[PDB]
Amino acid sequence: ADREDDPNFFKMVEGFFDRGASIVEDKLVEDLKTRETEEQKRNRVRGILRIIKPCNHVLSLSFPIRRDDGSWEVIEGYRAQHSQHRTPCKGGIRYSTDVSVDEVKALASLMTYKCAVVDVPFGGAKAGVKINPKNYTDNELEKITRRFTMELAKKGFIGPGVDVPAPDMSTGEREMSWIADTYASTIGHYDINAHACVTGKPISQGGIHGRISATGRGVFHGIENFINEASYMSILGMTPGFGDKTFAVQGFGNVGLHSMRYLHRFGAKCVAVGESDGSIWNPDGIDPKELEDFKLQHGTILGFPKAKIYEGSILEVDCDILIPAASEKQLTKSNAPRVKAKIIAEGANGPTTPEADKIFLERNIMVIPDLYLNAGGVTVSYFEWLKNLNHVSYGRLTFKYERDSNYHLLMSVQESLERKFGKHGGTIPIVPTAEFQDRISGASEKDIVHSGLAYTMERSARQIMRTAMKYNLGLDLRTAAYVNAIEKVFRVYNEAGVTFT
Amino acid sequence: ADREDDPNFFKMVEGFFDRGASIVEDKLVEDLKTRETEEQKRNRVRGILRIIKPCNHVLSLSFPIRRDDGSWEVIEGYRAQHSQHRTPCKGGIRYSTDVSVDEVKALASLMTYKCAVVDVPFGGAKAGVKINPKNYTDNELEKITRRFTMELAKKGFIGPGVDVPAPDMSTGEREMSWIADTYASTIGHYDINAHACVTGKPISQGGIHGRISATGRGVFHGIENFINEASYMSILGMTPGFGDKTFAVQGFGNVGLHSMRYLHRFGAKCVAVGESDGSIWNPDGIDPKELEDFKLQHGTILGFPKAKIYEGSILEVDCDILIPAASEKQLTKSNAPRVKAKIIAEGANGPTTPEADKIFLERNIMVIPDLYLNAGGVTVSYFEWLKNLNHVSYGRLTFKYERDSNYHLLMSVQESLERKFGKHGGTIPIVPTAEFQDRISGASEKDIVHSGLAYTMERSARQIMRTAMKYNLGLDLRTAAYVNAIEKVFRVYNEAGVTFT
Amino acid sequence: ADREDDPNFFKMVEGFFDRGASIVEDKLVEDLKTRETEEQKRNRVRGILRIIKPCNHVLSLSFPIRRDDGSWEVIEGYRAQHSQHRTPCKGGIRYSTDVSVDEVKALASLMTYKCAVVDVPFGGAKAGVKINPKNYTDNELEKITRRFTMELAKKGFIGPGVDVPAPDMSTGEREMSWIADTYASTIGHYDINAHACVTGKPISQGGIHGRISATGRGVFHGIENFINEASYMSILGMTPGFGDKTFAVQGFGNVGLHSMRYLHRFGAKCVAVGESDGSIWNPDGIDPKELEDFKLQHGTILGFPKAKIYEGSILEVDCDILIPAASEKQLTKSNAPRVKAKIIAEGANGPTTPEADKIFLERNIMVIPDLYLNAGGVTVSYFEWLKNLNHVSYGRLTFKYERDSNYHLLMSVQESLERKFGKHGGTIPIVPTAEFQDRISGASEKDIVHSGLAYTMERSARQIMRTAMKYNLGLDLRTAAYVNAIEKVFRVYNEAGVTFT
Amino acid sequence: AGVKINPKNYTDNELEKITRRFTMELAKKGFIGPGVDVPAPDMSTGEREMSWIADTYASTIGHYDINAHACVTGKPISQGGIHGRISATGRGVFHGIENFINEASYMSILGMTPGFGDKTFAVQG
Numbered sequence A, B, C: 001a002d003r004e005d006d007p008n009f010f011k012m013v014e015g016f017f018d019r020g021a022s023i024v025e026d027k028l029v030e031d032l033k034t035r036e037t038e039e040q041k042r043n044r045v046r047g048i049l050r051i052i053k054p055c056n057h058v059l060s061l062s063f064p065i066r067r068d069d070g071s072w073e074v075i076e077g078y079r080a081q082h083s084q085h086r087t088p089c090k091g092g093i094r095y096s097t098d099v100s101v102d103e104v105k106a107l108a109s110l111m112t113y114k115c116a117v118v119d120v121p122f123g124g125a126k127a128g129v130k131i132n133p134k135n136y137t138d139n140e141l142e143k144i145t146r147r148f149t150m151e152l153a154k155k156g157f158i159g160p161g162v163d164v165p166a167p168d169m170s171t172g173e174r175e176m177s178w179i180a181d182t183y184a185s186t187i188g189h190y191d192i193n194a195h196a197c198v199t200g201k202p203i204s205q206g207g208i209h210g211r212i213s214a215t216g217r218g219v220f221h222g223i224e225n226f227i228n229e230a231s232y233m234s235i236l237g238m239t240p241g242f243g244d245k246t247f248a249v250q251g252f253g254n255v256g257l258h259s260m261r262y263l264h265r266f267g268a269k270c271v272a273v274g275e276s277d278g279s280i281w282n283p284d285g286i287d288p289k290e291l292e293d294f295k296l297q298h299g300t301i302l303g304f305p306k307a308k309i310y311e312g313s314i315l316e317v318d319c320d321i322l323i324p325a326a327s328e329k330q331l332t333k334s335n336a337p338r339v340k341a342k343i344i345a346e347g348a349n350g351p352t353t354p355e356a357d358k359i360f361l362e363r364n365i366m367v368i369p370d371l372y373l374n375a376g377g378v379t380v381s382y383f384e385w386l387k388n389l390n391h392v393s394y395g396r397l398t399f400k401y402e403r404d405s406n407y408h409l410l411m412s413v414q415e416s417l418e419r420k421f422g423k424h425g426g427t428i429p430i431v432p433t434a435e436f437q438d439r440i441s442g443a444s445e446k447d448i449v450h451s452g453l454a455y456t457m458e459r460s461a462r463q464i465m466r467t468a469m470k471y472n473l474g475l476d477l478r479t480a481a482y483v484n485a486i487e488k489v490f491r492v493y494n495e496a497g498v499t500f501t
Numbered sequence D: 001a002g003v004k005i006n007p008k009n010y011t012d013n014e015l016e017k018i019t020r021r022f023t024m025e026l027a028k029k030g031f032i033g034p035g036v037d038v039p040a041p042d043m044s045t046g047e048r049e050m051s052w053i054a055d056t057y058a059s060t061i062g063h064y065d066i067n068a069h070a071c072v073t074g075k076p077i078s079q080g081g082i083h084g085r086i087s088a089t090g091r092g093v094f095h096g097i098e099n100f101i102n103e104a105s106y107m108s109i110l111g112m113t114p115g116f117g118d119k120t121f122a123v124q125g
């Protein structure tokens, strides 16, 4: 909670949707399959948009757990399923005292739009358990996640084909592990796809390579796509590339840490890092790795030797790129005019209110929207889910076959040339480059995850760019993004007797 | 109605619970099976009470329906399951613009406590669809109930063993029929007990005799039990019996109409009847039957020839008994001091606020609580559910056998006497009385429903009376009732996964 | 065999496990994720190893079958499921009077360790029906396998995602066919993956290319990997390669016949073949093909014209390689000192006791362990299971696309060179080699089965070699193998469904 | 069924884990269900264990089964148990004995008088 300008998270998102819906409404009536074309078409389009906006299902739970002391404690949880236009609903689980019905629904709706933007065939969903993880033992957290799983499973809120959870705030591999085990040990004990019931699992329990760093990596790609445009960078008056760029990230968890690791890898330097207790700062930069070790060692960043405890909001720090990677509504009407940064990389979901958004546009600040920028998580979660359904690790059945084929292919040009140039040319060795040598056997799980995500982030970046052009949206990439998501979802709703006369 | 006595229906009920919980807390620690008796027992009791109070599950739905005009309309619905300490959850479905999450949860919790009071083995549940039935065609209402059914069925909110709905405001045999048919035609097409998925069904579709009039009949019995006590009636300064009693009922639907029919049958006379558009009045009384015909004929009571359009609130009319049989919170702090009547027969759920309750006690008004008085509905719904599971109509297999047995039994005393008194006594015909002649073949479906409900209402009336004595609750029958319900529900948690650390 | 050495097959295997477990215990505490590092970690490792060793489930059955004569006969069968750390349990079915609970459990545990060694995602299982196939008509064997299938299916011991059987002693395509049909015709009649319930099926019933010869082929590869090391071959004082090697195989069934076919293909010559009735012998070698025809013709090898009925144990024959491909414990303390051969290729499961193992090491005999050497069966069974789940024969959707692509790729270097060297160089035809021409369309089912198995056997061979180095195990490849299997199974328990941190 | 442990050497928390886990393993292999196999108490088990068993089955595999609680007997009366189930065996022992102890024919061969009134007995357990 802010104080002033702290919109109902759900209505806030509903606003972004509307903003984009009014922009594409014409094109939706344009290519609308109605026979009786007469602006009633315009009404049928509106009728469909009113279906998409609200969540279809919201399950509120209140269940008891036994503390390690012996006392019983009632704990509350929620799971919202926003859309089912794509069968398996998808969305993580958040553990924090801030979860409520409205937050879970806003987040659930962000999931469907983000999946749509990045072409992941999932309807959006989201869960939250209203507790503060820090105040519970590991034994208690397990009871909590496992019991929550059972309650969702009995009401149809988790299943490989109905709804697949994943991590979020204060949850990770560990919780995903308990969730999978509980589902597989009970309701899905006969299901050949029982372990595809949740993603973000540990690699040993059926998880996929780089899922933990997938979001930060996607953040790196999302930024990379726009930071090399020149066109956009000129409006912001910056030079393309990361090499001479500074950035500050609010959040040092799964998203922030890794976003930081990746930008730093490409020359950019982190001038500031923030957390709930405070922020640290250094104009000469901070190394993500020694900061991680200090965090793992002291349970905090404050007091890190090679930086100073910054005083005065990480969000207003001086930098080129600001990466809010914590919770929602961190950027509001009251602090927007003081952000300093030129690019806001939305790693978190809903970090800026529609009011800061207005201010940001007017100050010529580029805000790379969350429904695109942080989609790296679901994109790789989707690859994990796919891996579970296929029951083989990528390339296992083809490494040798491809390897031999590539050598015989190269041998084909070698023999063709030598026979064409005879003994006058001698042997003409056609050998793999060092680079191709690394790819001689074909893609591994890691290859697909890396190349697949890059492909996805770049492809979606283009569509967002192409749409912002067609509608002259300038630096309003958020509106361009929702236009794209709406176009896609609307599509499943229109086609033939699905919804028309 | 009201302005400043609109407490949250849910917190309101939670208050009643607490009121009773503090009264029985001692006895719950008394017969508590803890080994380590040391007021931590008192804490374990509190721990259990905190589990019972909140609803375990609440499903919120938002689904689209196609109007008869062609346009799509999103409609909202809810289904709360308060407790599962008794496997099949039980509760009706309300169609009104007043439904919301809090109303459905309050009503759901009233269901478990009422079932407990009247010994029906069901956990409480309740559904509400936020629409105004009058503004919809029958074709549209069907689409609505059927689609609502499918959405609940897929999330585990309807099933013979999980959750069994029934009628409530603006729903009846018809909706229950669509609900059963939808469930049976799909998810339960292989279930031998598919039709036990919902109660209040038409008798031709597996419904039970007198289910529609069961609530009014239970209202009659609930009142009858206290109106013949003398002890209670003296504190109220009234004579026992209905013969010289006047009453007014707010609500002329399934509950009110029949409550009216029954009281009138036993001499009491209805001086007033109310509805949403207004009320009618007649000191000499109103005949339930000619009023029903006028209602069926003109869609309203206003303008009924044999009564005058009363002017000025049905609740403040002059009578001995006031039967609120409409919606919740009709009796508040502002109109309580003007009720006139001595007995408030709570036919509806939650008709009086805790404030009116206080005023009512002080003015020596007896309020027969809803969780007891209107339990006639679930009691017979339970009989219906039982009938569906047994697949036979009551007595079908035994009518003839019992008939013959009774005659041979009577013949046994006849022959014994004649042989003992020889030809000196002649034939000594032992024949059934007129009354016994009606029962010679044993109970039919109708017999069980009538005798079973009477047995239930009377047995629960005694327990409420016995508890009000033991705790000196005077005319606070509501607190006595919750004490009874709590004692019972508590008793399942006490030995659930059992205790002894 | 032996009296002084005929250990309890299950304990025997449990010993091998322990032998390897003590060797890796340090590394398991090394990379152990416990926070509280203090040798209690060492205890947590031991706690996990004690979980892995015993079978989780063992089902014993006693069921009646009607003989062709008319009489009823009770027959006994067992199915042990050793581990479920990998969802689908995997393991064949043995028909022999030697099956018992302890044998089935030892075999079941060998399955998990072998799958682990060769990276097949299956928990180990094994079934045995205590009968002598020869004493039953085909009609009776069918009743037996089909009824055995139903009994396992009803208790959760067969299903595409719970437990997938395959052939073993005295069972093959035929039994696997009856098994699949029975499962699919009943319990799995609605399951899209019903036919993945069992492997080793006939190719027409959903089986996979080369599954029958897969084990012998894997035996060939397992041997090939070590027979070309020089390092190992020097310790044994032999020259690498098969070209000048003699071998004798005990067993002429699915494993022995094909192991023989393959070694013979690469120059090695079979000097002896054994069976239950006796053995044949020829210093100049025996042709696998004319021996198969004689066997198929006379139901035995004894009396084969081109060889002499050897007199005196096939296991003590004079050769370089001894391939025991029959039943367990054929090599014991009493005959080990007389094996003659330098390499023992364990085609069968458990052919040598821990005592012969000791003797074998001391005499510098290399024993290529069964959990690696015969893993060719499950490896290809896994490919079959995968094929059933994918519902397409390999390459069907891509043969043409790949073919065209390869020619356009080749055309790309051709046109690039011709345009670069103009009419001065003429046409520079870039054509596929003969070899590449065979691969121009990409891999077929047969290609994957062959290249996939080779890849697997070679990859596992390396890991076994790398581990034997790291722990200086010399020719104790068996201990190296168990170390690898344990490392893998323990990884799964490391993060595990629980969390201990 | 039998679980090879000595109840006395385990806390109540541990016994629960044990019975509940045992239930799940049996349920997944078809060894407990209202229509397949219904357990009950025996040596070192009673209402309590039967309660954990029912709850585990009902909370999981039988969550939709209208007869989920008929999966086990000897349950506490509050959890769906029946009157006098605990004393039912001893009561049946009384009846079984009563039937023969009043035969005269049998009691004469044993040279005893019918009835319990003048009889002594010792029970092991």
Ligand SMILES: NC(=O)C1=CN([C@@H]2O[C@H](COP(=O)(O)OP(=O)(O)OC[C@H]3O[C@@H](n4cnc5c(N)ncnc54)[C@H](OP(=O)(O)O)[C@@H]3O)[C@@H](O)[C@H]2O)C=CC1
Pocket (backbone or CB within 6 Å): A092, A166, A167, A168, A169, A170, A171, A215, A250, A251, A252, A253, A254, A255, A256, A274, A275, A276, A277, A325, A326, A327, A328, A347, A348, A349, A350, A374, A375, A377, A378
């Ligand atoms: N797979 C995923 O987890 C994905 C996450 N995301 C996005 O990233 C965010 C999730 O981060 P995860 O949930 O990944 O983060 P994790 O909980 O690890 O994040 C931990 C960090 O969040 C910080 N934080 C929380 N609140 C504040 C605050 N008010 N001010 C400063 N720092 C704060 C924490 O500080 P402290 O430790 O003191 O609480 C800590 O540094 C989400 O909002 C979501 O939209 C998007 C896609 C995928």
Ligand SMILES: NC(=O)C1=CN([C@@H]2O[C@H](COP(=O)(O)OP(=O)(O)OC[C@H]3O[C@@H](n4cnc5c(N)ncnc54)[C@H](OP(=O)(O)O)[C@@H]3O)[C@@H](O)[C@H]2O)C=CC1
Pocket (backbone or CB within 6 Å): B092, B167, B168, B169, B170, B171, B215, B250, B251, B252, B253, B254, B255, B274, B275, B276, B277, B325, B326, B327, B328, B347, B348, B349, B350, B374, B375, B377, B378
């Ligand atoms: N089986 C059952 O139905 C049971 C019902 N109950 C209780 O009784 C109530 C249900 O009545 P049902 O729902 O049975 O009634 P039905 O809809 O028939 O009741 C119809 C009557 O209610 C009147 N009414 C509604 N609101 C008001 C109001 N604000 N003021 C005056 N009259 C009003 C209607 O007038 P109009 O048509 O103009 O709106 C109409 O005459 C419930 O609240 C429930 O708690 C308890 C147990 C069982």
Ligand SMILES: NC(=O)C1=CN([C@@H]2O[C@H](COP(=O)(O)OP(=O)(O)OC[C@H]3O[C@@H](n4cnc5c(N)ncnc54)[C@H](OP(=O)(O)O)[C@@H]3O)[C@@H](O)[C@H]2O)C=CC1
Pocket (backbone or CB within 6 Å): C167, C168, C169, C170, C171, C215, C250, C251, C252, C253, C254, C255, C274, C275, C276, C277, C325, C326, C327, C328, C347, C348, C349, C350, C374, C375, C376, C377, C378
């Ligand atoms: N896919 C697979 O089938 C795999 C099998 N294996 C291993 O191979 C063995 C299975 O062979 P299958 O079961 O494949 O073989 P099949 O039954 O065909 O083997 C038949 C041959 O084994 C001979 N034989 C059996 N027992 C003895 C004995 N005690 N002494 C001498 N000769 C004997 C038989 O002679 P006769 O007919 O007169 O009895 C017969 O010629 C198993 O132990 C298993 O561990 C391992 C991995 C994969």
Ligand SMILES: Nc1nc2c(ncn2[C@@H]2O[C@H](COP(=O)(O)OP(=O)(O)OP(=O)(O)O)[C@@H](O)[C@H]2O)c(=O)[nH]1
Pocket (backbone or CB within 6 Å): A209, A210, A211, A212, A213, A289, A292, A446
């Ligand atoms: N938290 C953290 N994780 C790391 C670090 N280095 C690597 N990883 C993690 O695991 C990778 C371990 O990766 P490898 O297989 O060597 O990774 P890679 O594909 O070259 O990794 P890229 O480095 O992902 O970022 C990432 O997915 C990270 O989640 C680190 O310094 N800190």
Ligand SMILES: Nc1nc2c(ncn2[C@@H]2O[C@H](COP(=O)(O)OP(=O)(O)OP(=O)(O)O)[C@@H](O)[C@H]2O)c(=O)[nH]1
Pocket (backbone or CB within 6 Å): B210, B212, B213, B261, B289, B292
């Ligand atoms: N709405 C309404 N229903 C009535 C009336 N009288 C009887 N019923 C019916 O009670 C019916 C069948 O009643 P029997 O004929 O079986 O009824 P009953 O047992 O004599 O009814 P009671 O006298 O109230 O006990 C149901 O089908 C109701 O429709 C009435 O005056 N109005």
Ligand SMILES: Nc1nc2c(ncn2[C@@H]2O[C@H](COP(=O)(O)OP(=O)(O)OP(=O)(O)O)[C@@H](O)[C@H]2O)c(=O)[nH]1
Pocket (backbone or CB within 6 Å): C209, C210, C211, C212, C213, C257, C289, C292, C446
């Ligand atoms: N036992 C046996 N099986 C054979 C023989 N010839 C062919 N087969 C069977 O089918 C193969 C038919 O194989 P082809 O397509 O010609 O085999 P390859 O040419 O692909 O076969 P391999 O050399 O065994 O890899 C094997 O899988 C056998 O099961 C034979 O002489 N004996």
Ligand SMILES: Nc1nc2c(ncn2[C@@H]2O[C@H](COP(=O)(O)OP(=O)(O)OP(=O)(O)O)[C@@H](O)[C@H]2O)c(=O)[nH]1
Pocket (backbone or CB within 6 Å): D084, D086, D087
């Ligand atoms: N262990 C034990 N159980 C008893 C004893 N007395 C009664 N029970 C109980 O039998 C109970 C209820 O018994 P009642 O209805 O009062 O027994 P009766 O009065 O029907 O009992 P009996 O005289 O034994 O036939 C169960 O809850 C058992 O605990 C007793 O002295 N010892």
Ligand SMILES: O=C1Nc2ccc(I)cc2/C1=C\c1cc(Br)c(O)c(Br)c1
Pocket (backbone or CB within 6 Å): A142, A143, A146, A147, A150, A181, A182, A185, A186, D059
């Ligand atoms: O299936 C399960 N395996 C488990 C291992 C450890 C623990 I702690 C719980 C489980 C589990 C199921 C489970 C199921 C429910 Br219903 C529940 O409330 C809890 Br607590 C656990």
Ligand SMILES: O=C1Nc2ccc(I)cc2/C1=C\c1cc(Br)c(O)c(Br)c1
Pocket (backbone or CB within 6 Å): B142, B143, B146, B147, B150, B181, B182, B185, B186
């Ligand atoms: O199973 C069903 N039988 C029906 C008969 C008439 C009608 I109108 C609907 C049904 C029905 C299922 C049904 C299911 C869903 Br889904 C739905 O939105 C609607 Br309209 C109906």
Ligand SMILES: O=C1Nc2ccc(I)cc2/C1=C\c1cc(Br)c(O)c(Br)c1
Pocket (backbone or CB within 6 Å): C142, C143, C144, C146, C147, C150, C181, C182, C183, C185, C186
């Ligand atoms: O499901 C089944 N399909 C069959 C086809 C032919 C035959 I012979 C048997 C089956 C069969 C099931 C089956 C099941 C059991 Br019981 C049994 O004892 C047998 Br003889 C057969």
Ligand SMILES: O=C1Nc2ccc(I)cc2/C1=C\c1cc(Br)c(O)c(Br)c1
Pocket (backbone or CB within 6 Å): A185, D016, D017, D020, D021, D024, D025, D055, D056, D059, D060
């Ligand atoms: O369904 C279940 N409800 C529970 C409540 C408390 C506890 I401790 C366990 C359960 C439970 C299921 C359960 C299931 C499994 Br499989 C298991 O190993 C354990 Br331990 C528990």
